[PDB]
From a paper:
In its active tetradecameric conformation, [name] forms the central proteolytic compartment of a larger AAA+ protease machine. Two rings of seven [name] monomers stack and interact to form a secluded barrel‐shaped tetradecamer harbouring the 14 catalytic sites. Small entrance pores at the top and bottom of the barrel restrict access of proteins and allow isolated [name] to degrade small peptides only. For protein degradation, Clp‐ATPases are required (in Firmicutes ClpX, ClpC, and ClpE) to unfold designated substrates and thread them through the entrance pores.
In order to gain further insight into the interaction of ADEP with [name] from [name] and thereby support our functional analyses of the mutated [name] [name] proteins, we generated and solved the corresponding co‐crystal structure in conjunction with the apo‐protein at resolutions of 2.2 Å and 1.9 Å, respectively. In the apo structure of [name] [name] presented here, two distinct conformations can be differentiated, like in a previous crystal structure of [name]. Five out of seven subunits display a well‐defined upwards pointing β‐hairpin loop and downwards facing N termini. In contrast, in the remaining two, a structural inversion of the first nineteen amino acids can be observed. This inversion leads to the loss of the structured hairpin and the respective N termini are facing upwards with a slight tilt towards the barrel rotation axis. The residues E9 to D19 form a loop that extends into the axial channel and, in conjunction with the terminal residues M1 to V7, facilitate pore closure. In our apo‐[name] structure, where two out of seven subunits are in this disordered state, the pore is effectively closed. An overlay of the D27 moieties of all [name] subunits within one apo‐[name] ring shows a stable conformation in suitable H‐bond distance to R23, while upon insertion of the hydrophobic ADEP tail region this order is disturbed. In apo‐[name] residues 1–19 are highly flexible, dynamically alternating between two states. The first state is characterised by an ordered upwards‐pointing β‐hairpin, stabilised by a network of electrostatic interactions between E9, R23 and D27.
Residue numbers in the entry:
A (entry chain G), D (entry chain D), F (entry chain A), G (entry chain B): 2 to 192
B (entry chain F): 1 to 10, 17 to 197
C (entry chain E), J (entry chain K): 3 to 192
E (entry chain C): 2 to 10, 15 to 192
H (entry chain H): 4 to 9, 18 to 192
I (entry chain L): 2 to 11, 17 to 199
The structure:
Amino acid sequence: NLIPTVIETTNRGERAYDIYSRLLKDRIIMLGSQIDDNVANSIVSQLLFLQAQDSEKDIYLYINSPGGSVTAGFAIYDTIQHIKPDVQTICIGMAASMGSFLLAAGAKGKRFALPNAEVMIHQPLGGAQGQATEIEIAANHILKTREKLNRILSERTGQSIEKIQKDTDRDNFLTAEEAKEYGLIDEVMVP
Amino acid sequence: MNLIPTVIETAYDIYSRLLKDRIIMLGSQIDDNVANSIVSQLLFLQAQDSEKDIYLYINSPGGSVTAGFAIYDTIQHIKPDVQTICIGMAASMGSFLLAAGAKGKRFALPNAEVMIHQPLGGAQGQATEIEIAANHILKTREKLNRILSERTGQSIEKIQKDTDRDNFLTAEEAKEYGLIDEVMVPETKWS
Amino acid sequence: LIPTVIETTNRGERAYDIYSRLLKDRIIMLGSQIDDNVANSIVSQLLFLQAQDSEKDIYLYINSPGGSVTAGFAIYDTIQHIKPDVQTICIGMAASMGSFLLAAGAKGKRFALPNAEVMIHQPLGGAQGQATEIEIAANHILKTREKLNRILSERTGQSIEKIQKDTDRDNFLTAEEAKEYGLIDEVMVP
Amino acid sequence: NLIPTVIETTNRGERAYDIYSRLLKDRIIMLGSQIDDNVANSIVSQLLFLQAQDSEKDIYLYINSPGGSVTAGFAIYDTIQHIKPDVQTICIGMAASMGSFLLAAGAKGKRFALPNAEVMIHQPLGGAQGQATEIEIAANHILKTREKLNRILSERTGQSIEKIQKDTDRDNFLTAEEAKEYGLIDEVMVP
Amino acid sequence: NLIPTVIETERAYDIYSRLLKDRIIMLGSQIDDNVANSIVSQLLFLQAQDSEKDIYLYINSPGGSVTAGFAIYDTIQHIKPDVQTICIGMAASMGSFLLAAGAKGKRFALPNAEVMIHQPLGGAQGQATEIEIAANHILKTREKLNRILSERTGQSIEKIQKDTDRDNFLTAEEAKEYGLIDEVMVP
Amino acid sequence: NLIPTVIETTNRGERAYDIYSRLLKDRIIMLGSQIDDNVANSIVSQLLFLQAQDSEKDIYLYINSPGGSVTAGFAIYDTIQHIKPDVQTICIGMAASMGSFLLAAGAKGKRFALPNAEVMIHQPLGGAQGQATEIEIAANHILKTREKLNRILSERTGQSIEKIQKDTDRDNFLTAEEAKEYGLIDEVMVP
Amino acid sequence: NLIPTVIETTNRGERAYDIYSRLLKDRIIMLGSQIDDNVANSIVSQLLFLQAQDSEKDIYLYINSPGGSVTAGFAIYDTIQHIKPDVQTICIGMAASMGSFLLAAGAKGKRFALPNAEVMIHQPLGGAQGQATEIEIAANHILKTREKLNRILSERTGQSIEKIQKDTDRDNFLTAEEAKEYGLIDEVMVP
Amino acid sequence: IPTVIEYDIYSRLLKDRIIMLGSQIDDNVANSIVSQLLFLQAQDSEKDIYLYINSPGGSVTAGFAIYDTIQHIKPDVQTICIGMAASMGSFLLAAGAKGKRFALPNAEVMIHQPLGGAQGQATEIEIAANHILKTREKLNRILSERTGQSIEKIQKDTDRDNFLTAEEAKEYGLIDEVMVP
Amino acid sequence: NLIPTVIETTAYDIYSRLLKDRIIMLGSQIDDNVANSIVSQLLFLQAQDSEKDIYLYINSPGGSVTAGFAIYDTIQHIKPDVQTICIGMAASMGSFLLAAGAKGKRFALPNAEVMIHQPLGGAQGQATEIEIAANHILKTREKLNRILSERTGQSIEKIQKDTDRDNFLTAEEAKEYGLIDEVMVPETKWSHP
Amino acid sequence: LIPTVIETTNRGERAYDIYSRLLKDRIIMLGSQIDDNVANSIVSQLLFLQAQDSEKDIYLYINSPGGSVTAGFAIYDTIQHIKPDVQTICIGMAASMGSFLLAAGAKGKRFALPNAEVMIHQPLGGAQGQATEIEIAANHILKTREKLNRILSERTGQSIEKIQKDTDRDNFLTAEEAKEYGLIDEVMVP
């Protein structure tokens, strides 16, 4: 039992939705995996389609993710800012790395976490191999990527870039209350 | 009219047939994929009817704590009561979810087992990195024990002692512990 | 390759896999090892059939080498829990937890075909780690064996002491031998 | 190109069958692989379905199989004898081991092979590992299983148990004509 | 709902299935039990639809299992309709055997198609007596293939034995001359 | 991982589209992978289909790709140029190597990047093995391929061949604004 | 990865086509992979299907292929020649080895390449292992195969067999214009 | 000749008629110990030999090469269990000169039934089963002779792993004395 | 009592026999094991005689930079002149050691190859960790180039440019570059040692 | 597992492996692929033999499929540099860099046994990476080929142009063909 189906019956007969497609009808998108190009391609396409249907109505992005690719993360980030409707973000379980970046990327006032959800922030990870000059190019690129991430996190959270740099040097785990205090979300969702 | 093909396992599978009657079947380890699916089913069922009970059958060795908390928080968040029924085994995060069902509506069948223990994990790298990971797991244990204490009526101190090692409980022991409310006996089939 | 059956209804054609087609006639096919996935499916089918009709009999065919004891117990308790009588029919082999489920069918409604085999034995497992962790695991499996033997005793009429001796090692039984044992009620003659 | 689809257009629409499901509609079952518990489950289910559709019309079981599991073979064997319709057996290509046993299990007068089909008989195979007494138990079991197979073969072919024992000590390949002479089949199907 | 239409494969109406509507069977792989069972099934279905109209079997195959090939061969002989055989690309080993097995006057190859004939291949492991049984079996299987090829080509068993000792590649024209096909299909 | 479905209800039917096929209905093509022959075959086919539906309406090509095969990239490049509609290009996330080549291949005035999308340019990569003569043939071939690539990029950007050669000697990472200044795109799309 | 779908309103209801089956309605066949027996089976099937639809109208074969099996290539080659419709060939990206052979195989005056498409010609490749007499048989066969390829290529291009032999001794890469001058194609399609 | 611990330390003890078994019993180990036993007899056919045993056992045939060589030679072979003597290890410990079988106070002994495998035809499985059952009968008979226990008791006591302390091994008759410091 | 003689070990091998004549034979990659052995040989030879020349034959694709510096620093540290002779190839740290020989005593045979390029490395982990690894390899390159400048007479600027990619030099080009002092030709066999 | 030879010397019994015993008689055995390790050993043997006697001939037996060009040149240059003549004797096969070393023997003292084989071809290699890197590797291997052909031309008396043509593909020569070519001076009669 992985992904169940929901049947609706209308004057056109039966139609079948997988559970995620059923929620998409209600403008809900689930980000529930590692972020890669396939995942970003999917989320981007869902956002574009939802705007096409209605440019005024809110979209709800549920986030349970350990992060992943920074550029895939930025394809989702930029699409969210680009479209007309507000995108609410809701953290369930865990938002780490690029996942926590996307959580912070929701419409101001509309970023949430459930009470026992975990938020983790840290610096980007990568690799470099080859000649000294090639390692230099790769190091400069990851350093500039970190600067870009911190700059945006500063705008979204209200914290200084200096504070962001210090707090992301090592793995930094926050509770839902701490994430609110930090400025990564706006509210902890009460039962 | 168009009718959706029906199957036991993948189309309209046996689990989707139960979902129509507001039953969710957990029969695997808890990972992010399973949690995201269960969360989605829970949100779907609330949207269909905010008042009617939901039924969550649990046979699970447990798994990810964060994936488990995604389910846990969704259950508390939603309006309908979620009944939990242990069949076979509920271990680790599986037992945590069983204990999280609506008060008075947490059940086990007579030969089902319940296992409670401490969270497991790993760390590698620098002394400072191991420290951060140790602190994180210890805080995760404190969070789990605090909630179990609230849901069982057992003290935090007692939970800590009883979970130091693998602790197997019968259905009756689980009831006495406060993990469940009632052992469902075959004699009361017809009430 | 699981075959499809298409049925005509007054509002259109419906495709079934062969197993869902038999499910329409209240037949459940167990033809594999018992694990959490298989137990989830069998339990789901049992609950579905109870919800369709709480009075009509269910037919559970069993060809299984066994598997997880906890997964087996999920099925066992579900069978005891539901209102309908669950008939059990052994075809091929019911071994270990498979034979436990065979014996769990409704009294008078436990069958084997003439050449079907039954095997009973003690539970299998493992433990790794500290002396204390090995002790917890040994006590648990020993308690599990007592539970299995107690229920088997009640379902077969054999004493707990006899069950213990007979399950010490692999014990292969013919369909007639299983009937004599009290694991089934009748051998189904063609 | 593995498994093609056939389309039939009816008064109330269009219906699509894979080739094997199309033949099943004409009471034809294809046993075309090694016999295991999963193959047996599908064959038994098809036989049970066909009897429920019509309890008197013949069933046709085509066999191209190297054989496999004895107990899975017996699930099929016992189901065939149990149901009311006559089950015709037709060897195409090869029937070896448990496949040749099932070929001989067809309704008397209705067991066939095509002229160039190959039939092989031999003693059961297996294994045993562990303590001396465990090896003894496993040896006693396979020997008793061989006795059971030989006894039924005797009933089905008219050959003595003594002859079957000798003729199956090692791999014994038979032509369609030799299989008829042996009593494994009734007729060689001539073009 | 209508099944989706695709080139290659839910369930789907692929290009091969669309040809099967016109009584054409496409063999474009090695011959194993799965391929054979599907082809046998297609032949039985086509006979049941119409027992009079011709069937067309295109062959591009390196061969494979001899028993799987005989499952196809015997089904072709068994059914009422004529089965035309058409070699495209290559018919090797059991593939060339099936090419030769088409209806008399209705076995074809395209001009640049290749045909290869050779002896059966196999293995044996174990006791001396077990190697002997395996050896006798493969030699009998060769005898069976050569006798049938003899009837189907009009070549003597002696000549087939000699010509199949090693890998023997034939052009479409050489295959017609050999009696494996009846005609080379000219554009 | 599952791709969501969108069901479009028409007058007398229902169309169940996967999200990508739903966008294609609105003349949107999503390039969200490495470029290889299979991806090129699909993109080219989508372009041909869209031309056949309407030869005048714009097409939208979203690009999030690390590039890949040069020849496969040229199959797409030449198809874009061949067809009558304007193909707008929109970089989201990253366009690297052949991905950045296709980005620059869009209709003039209609090449775009989102604010945080990354663009990378570098020289072609390959390999050669065997005899001295064979290595010579492969070296000359890859050198001629680089000359072809640089000449086209020169035409598309307005930069000289000499400048492109220098700027592509090593991995060269560009921001969206830098990509605009370079002439690879025409505009950075602001929210 | 996933092939997009086109859905159209038809006399039998809403009909879904993969992008390639939709193009098949315009008599377009897309070769975008290595040539093996399965690819050949598919391409031959499409050619036969299109002839059955209409025996007079032209077919358009797009070629992006690194080549592959010579025998599979000849199954396609002979099918192209056998059928009544003219088959137009259009090189996009790369036509190498058997790919370039199929490109040259198109209807006289209807063989095309897009401006940046590449063509490569060389001799057949193979292998031989075993006894000296077996290596002899394999060598003779591949030499005979090369003679066959060169004779046909001579007929199709207008070049002498002697010139083909020399030009194909090693990997020989050609631009679209070079391929035209050679006689492999008739025209370069300018945008 | 150069000397190392690992002309080694074992070579030095062999001069004083000491043979060290501190590994699993396989054909290579058996060949070495047999060769050492034959060498010591050739040096002096009357003087005692000392065999130290710390072994989890191993091959039954390899163990029987050693056992039969002990019985064949003229010198008494004292056996001294250190650490653990399991399976064929405990068999060789019990095989020492009567009255000259020893264990150190914290040494362990384990007895159980032989282990094996079988794969193939029913007839082949039967031959292998009959073989291992005969092997067990041979081991149990010899163990009965060397301990004073009945064949019936040995059979019951070796059905599963049976761990013994040094004192328990003495009471069982596998050794004669537990050595005092 | 006499030590057994062999060409190569599985005993007094061929390299040990040449070591008696103060010849050290480098014919492999430079790793720590090779470096520790060569350093040990140099220290031994100095202890035998602090005056007499050492002869280091080099046929090496190079290897570990730190291992190469263990050898380099030992050469400079000891009293005797170490002659270097390139046979076959001296690449990367191999070419660095060739250049490290006693001034006036660095040779290549006529068909030997010399290759110079930049150091190679790797980094994985956090952005901060990649930065540390990059800075370390860049400083390592500066160090190598500085020493090559001093030993060849070429400017640091020239070496940087010339080592950006693989740069293959003939024996004569290596002389012209200042990596060696003389191409040892067969014609001088009898007239010169 | 090389056999040992023991000899009485001026102050005691000394053991040699078969190869170091032959080395006493100024014989070096090449019977493998050429790599840096093999070259280190061959070069070392040649330097040792020069130091033992600078005047007496050395005998190099060659059975080798070739291998590293640079490792081969280490050997080639050492031969040309040392004072004594190096005789070369081909047994079995001298292929690629092996046939180059065979041709490198003192002129008049290059031999093959009657059934020995000689093979000549162009250098083999590879390159991965950027277009610029592939160019550097291609220029390098082409320059390496020109160097080999120039020396072969000098050693054989054949033109560079003929050598280029004759080495385009694998070219197998009998012992008599290798003499005619100029790779050896004589085929040794039994």
